[PDB]
Amino acid sequence: KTPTFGKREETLTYQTRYAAYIIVSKPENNTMVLVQAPNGAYFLPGGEIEGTETKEEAIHREVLEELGISVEIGCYLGEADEYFYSNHRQTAYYNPGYFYVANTWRQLSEPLRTNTLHWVAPEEAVRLLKRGSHRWAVEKWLAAAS
């Protein structure tokens, strides 16, 4: 029932790590920002929850590090899960993701800068995003009216 994405390997044992992501949009020109890794993969802003962080605290840390922004976290879109293999970790991960919308945000600094930032149309984000869980979040947000 929980939207689930990613080819999982029946051979490997998956470790669980939780993640939180947020849609950060520029309503005035109908764009939203994506973070593109050095390897070329596009992601929503956010990431794996660390230490004793809440989902929201992980978001606050990530958008500062990646985007140089603060956010006012708004709507909770829901959970979408991702199965993947981390090459650098050499570890298979089960990744419950918790997806949110920023109501508003503020530019505070430059990003803390191996990734590149791309402001794109939401429909273009859907075409660029690496993960089915991320595409799911954008499509849900697109369908969510006032």
Of residues 2, 23, 24, the one with CA closest to residue 95: 2
CB-count exposure of residue 65 (10 Å: 0-12, 13-18, 19+) = middle
Whole-number Å distance between alpha carbons of 6 and 4:
7
Resolution (angstroms) equals 1.9
Q: Which residues contact 104 (CB under 8 A, 6 or more apart)?
A: 71, 72, 74
Q: What is the residue-wise DSSP string for 15-64? A: EE--EEEEE-EEGGGTEEEEEE-TTS-EE-SEEE--TT--HHHHHHHHHH
Amino acid symbol at 144 = A
The separation between CA 4 and the C-alpha centre of its own chain, rounded to angstroms, equals 15
Give CA–CA dist 43/131, Å, rounded.
7
- Dihedral angle at the C-alpha atoms of 64, 69, 75, 78, nearest 10 degrees? -30
Domains and CATH numbers, the chain: 1-146 (3.90.79.10)
Contacts with 32 (C-beta within 8 Å, 6 or more apart), sequence order? 23, 24, 25, 26, 119, 120, 121, 122, 125, 138
Q: How far apart are CA 90 and CA 106, in angstroms?
A: 36
Q: Could you give the CA distance from residue 6 to residue 84 in angstroms, rounded to a whole number?
A: 6
